[model samples]
Target: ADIYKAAVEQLTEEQKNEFKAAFDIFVLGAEDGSISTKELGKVMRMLGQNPTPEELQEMIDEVDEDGSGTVDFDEFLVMMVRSMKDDSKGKTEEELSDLFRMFDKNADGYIDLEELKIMLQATGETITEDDIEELMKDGDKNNDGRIDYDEFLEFMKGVE
Candidate 1:
């Protein structure tokens, strides 16, 4: 029995549909239900990661059960779940600018406290004016009380 299938088989039908759907576009080589290393790069992006060459081999070695340097559908499935497991919860960068898009609700280049309060208020009231003030200073590079893509991203990268 393929141990990878054993792992994938444990997934729910709903999950299997979503997981398998990620692959239909990735062009796995051969009918053996495997993807060659070349195709792995595209699928890496599908994994929400644009892995460098070294990182690609790391993932391949991690999942290429027989070490054939190719990944099985089952391997890909588990990798999909692995990707989902950490899909940007604690991550940031392009990931960070996304927060900029979100925080800059009106999508302003130089947004003010009200916009911050507007979006944040809905998420939770645990956020105070103090929290907002604190966040602004952290995001503002010179403490000049202005935040843009560069300053905001600079803040998050440091937090990471």
Candidate 2:
């Protein structure tokens, strides 16, 4: 049986359309193989803050499930729920920033291959160092031994 609460109940008709529109963006962005950063950027922009690549990545990483260097719609929805569920999870802006950087994976101003592969292998991706290096080389646009949000998005696009 379902015990539905008002808060979790249905939205206004307009709100439902708004919700679907927003969700569509997320689904298409992810399905388009944009990195979580780009997907998150779309979100932030929708929220009236055009976040930098670094800022967007940090926010999304905090909510990433499986630490997979990417996030799907389910994970994004969880973030929305949990973040609104309690106040403690609503960290200070600086605290959130630090948390994002903590999961940035690579130190190259963006989340990159080594960071993603390390996290992936930690979750049992069966990845090899060669595979990781190749991925990095393929995506690292700045040639800084890591990939930024845009570069990672491009790589993901290829994967799709």
Candidate 3:
């Protein structure tokens, strides 16, 4: 109930300004072009908000983009302000494309088993080789043996 102490530390003129300042302090901490789930998650944790593993998953998934114009840091604050409870709203439709772009080492706009392996490895989970196949198979919807963004979006929004 005392979340208010953290809420109005600066007495900014507008709520957006408050949110803007708040985001800069916690996420950027110095202003920047991008942010990470872990660091972003940590800020949310310090909010004295519920920082369980589950909400972070749904939080990032809900963040959005409608392409370059609508997706700037302005939009990043849209639902993200609510997510105050998440990342998105950047130029380049960059959020998801850059996501696959980040994972798709060869730039085929797709991710396969080896790519999947690297992803799992980055996470703290104790996944095995057999489990990798099981995990990838679920998102390999077309039986095309790949985890493209289409497959990813489905799984991405599924943890709900």
Candidate 4:
């Protein structure tokens, strides 16, 4: 995405330094700041995936915008940011699921007000019944007096 490229280009100096550090890890025995197909395959193997030649070529094609048959630093950075965005989205969903599970003590698939209060207290926050009631007022979409996972996701999205 051009927007992602623009955002990456605007990264701070320290952020660029961090990207370079990550790049150095993969550029291990390579010079010219580029990764050959063989090197890329090796990297994939190191990551525990034995990618087929076609798969590897597909990956290179995704980021090798210039058709150079090799991935350079800029291409690598773009791919890295793209992959990170996807991973972050999945991780956010997983983390929210885990958070909801943590509060659903009865394993009944919903967070009651008492469970909400306990979860808040676990985070070192002192909460009263009225405090949780107010939170549920917005999050309990069906007004069933409890927060389901879907409603909790909506509430979390609002916080985000």
Candidate 5:
């Protein structure tokens, strides 16, 4: 499927090998190239999160492409890759938030036009005042003439 191709394309050679290593853990336990929801929950607990019965079932429903109500290694790898990507995106969003704060000098809780200009210059970007104004217009969700934290978050999301 298109989804599987995209997920696999996102991974590097090293990640593919690492995927095999991690999936090996579950495959060995199942002894039949697949794992039941109960065994999956056990491994999830071993990794530190306790899933409720419904949560485990939801996970199976999400990943079991064939509707077997169980996960084979290929399905497990796809889930693992998707989960890792999601976690990485969370960290990226946090980093973007931190950078937004760094650019918000004077601690006014907003990125005014001047502050945005300065921040862009700091990043070696030669943005003109007009360009900065356009960015402000584009990013200022509330049309408040400045970018608030939430607006900054939205802008970052859009850029991605």
Candidate 6:
């Protein structure tokens, strides 16, 4: 199916905005595709919404398919959405960022086996690092060492 066609057919305005914003940020590394992550971070800091190192690590970890640190486009998408909460609205930039951070626990700027385990424990289930690694291996797209933001969004949408 054509994703654009499907999106046109079924998405709400709020959802479209959210998804678009997420897509733009994840893929372009900036909301307007004009600034850099460093610049964006500075702006966010001015607004008191700066991402912690753990948040950055959260993104990095989620998107790092090969256990390498940097997130390529594909990995970025996977991690972004995988971390997305079910039934999200993406109403504001802050909301989107907060959602990103939710999965980026540990404030280390990445998600790791340990963080995944913590998230699982929060829901009352326990998983070993091996189990978490297996799950990421299964979920990651583009064969990256990790799932990117879009892949993550796709995962979140799939659950619904």
> What are the lDDT scores of the predictions, listed in order?
0.65, 0.54, 0.55, 0.68, 0.70, 0.48
Instruction: Give the true-structure RMSD of model 3.
Output: 15.0
Backbone clashes per model, in order? 1, 0, 2, 0, 0, 34
Tens digits of per-residue lDDT for model 2, 84-150 = 4444345444543453355576565677555777655643558788767776676655667655556
TM-score for candidate 3: 0.39
The runs of at least 3 residues in candidate 1 whose Cα sits more than 4 Å from the true structure, single-residue gaps closed, are: 1-92, 118-125
Better of 2 and 4 by lDDT: 4
**How far out, in Å, is residue 11 in model 6?**
36
Across residues 34-98, which tens digit of lDDT does each residue of candidate 3 receive?
A: 33444455545654456566666555554444322222234434434544422223444446555
Give the TM-score comparing model 6 with the true structure, all chains together. Answer: 0.31
What is the per-residue lDDT of model 5 for residues 35-134, given as tens digits with 9 covering 90 to 100?
A: 7775666556655456688767776687677655576656655656555564436566678789888888757878788888898887655878977777
TM-score-based ranking, best first? Answer: 5, 4, 1, 3, 2, 6
* Top of the candidates by TM-score: 5
What's the lDDT for candidate 2?
0.54
Off by over 4 Å in 2: 1-17, 26-35, 48-52, 82-85, 88-160
lDDT for model 5, on a 0 to 1 scale? 0.70
Cα lDDT tens digits, model 6, 41-74, are 3433543344675576555554455554454334
Q: What is candidate 1's lDDT per residue for 47-72, written digit by digit as tens?
A: 55766877677766776666666765
The list of candidate 4 runs beyond 4 A from truth reads 1-91
Clashes of 4: 0
Q: After superposition, how far is residue 153 of candidate 5 from its true place, in Å?
A: 13
- CA lDDT for candidate 4: 0.68
Task: List ranges where model 5 is wrong by over 4 Å.
Answer: 42-52, 86-160
Residue 140 lDDT in model 2? 59
Per-residue lDDT of 152 in model 3: 76
